[model samples]
Target: MKIISISETPNHNTMKITLSESREGMTSDTYTKVDDSQPAFINDILKVEGVKSIFHVMDFISVDKENDANWETVLPKVEAVFELEHHHHHH
Candidate 1:
């Protein structure tokens, strides 16, 4: 997969978005978060066209794409969710 974006936050985890042909990597603890509403948000994200997997940490969200997925169809959706929740402002 191709990396679309890499964002570093003050928290332990780092958020990234990759192309469909990429592999999913392990996330750092610094990026992790404790949110009770995460499961629902995750579910919503998984429903997006190319979302293969999702990782949630304290204030970050990492998205992985499926083999046939593309960032064009996925990143905006993920960004919408991020903007809605203000998750990207932690830094």
Candidate 2:
């Protein structure tokens, strides 16, 4: 699973990550309300610092951060989630 790009959304509170392959089975509209039935990647992403929630669908993952968090710092952590070996667990 390769990351295609990362960019901020119109809503400054969120940033989006695009993946090269489709992740059809994993999706969540609200992380707090999600269960194991949803994609496990959601939980891994939420573990990133300052991440409040995530909306994942198909190849896009839009992460929401705390109001006080800086994207400069948070973006690296978000990218790490995809780069690490642990990210391939369910694959």
Candidate 3:
């Protein structure tokens, strides 16, 4: 997967990362609660082999990367982490 761009709005404390190809052309926009425990969740994802960078948003994280990693090998893990950190029901 290739990450096209990453943006952060400090005023709103929101971050966004755009991937080369959307997951099934579906957007995974999640709103998470911010607290001390959340940084670890972001850190874990930043540790992924090809992850380029992680941006912190008001209540979300944007990960950027450029890699040949297969979605099957990466998505589940990412989705799991996202689900764990964000409280809202996922789409």
Candidate 4:
């Protein structure tokens, strides 16, 4: 999917990514951590260092980072999640 915009929240610790394509599978949800229940792409974001949570609905994805996390480093990683092809491979 292509990213339309990436904007930061008032606090700067969280950013929202607007995508050109709608999120696959579920229509809305929130994930605080990586787990088997989350989609492959969502897990990719949660796996990023300093990522504390993610909430997705339609084309927007809101990502929150820990207090110690720097947006300079974490933002790139979060954006990169869309670059990889998500195949939903079963374990």
Tens digit of per-residue lDDT, candidate 3, span 18-91: 44433332433432333444445555565655555555433335654545654455544655554463446659
Best by lDDT: 4
Alpha-carbon lDDT, every model: 0.51, 0.73, 0.47, 0.81
**TM-scores, all models, native as reference:** 0.49, 0.73, 0.42, 0.80
> Which RMSD does model 3 reach against the true structure?
11.7
Model 3 TM-score on a 0 to 1 scale: 0.42
Model 2, span 12-51: residue lDDT tens:
9998888886466555455644467545556666766778
- Say which prediction, candidate 2 or candidate 3, comes out ahead on lDDT: 2
Lowest-sum lDDT 10-residue window in model 2: 25-34
Estimate, for each residue in 1-91, the C-alpha lDDT of model 1 and write its tens digit: 2233555445322236433322233333321232443454455666777776666443345666676777766767766653454444445
Clashing residue pairs, backbone N/CA/C < 3 A, model 4: none
Q: What is the clash count for each candidate, in the order shown?
A: 11, 0, 1, 0
Q: Lowest lDDT 10-mer window, candidate 4?
A: 81-90
By TM-score rank, best first, the candidates go 4, 2, 1, 3
Tens digits of per-residue lDDT for model 4 on 40-63?
Answer: 777888888899988888888888
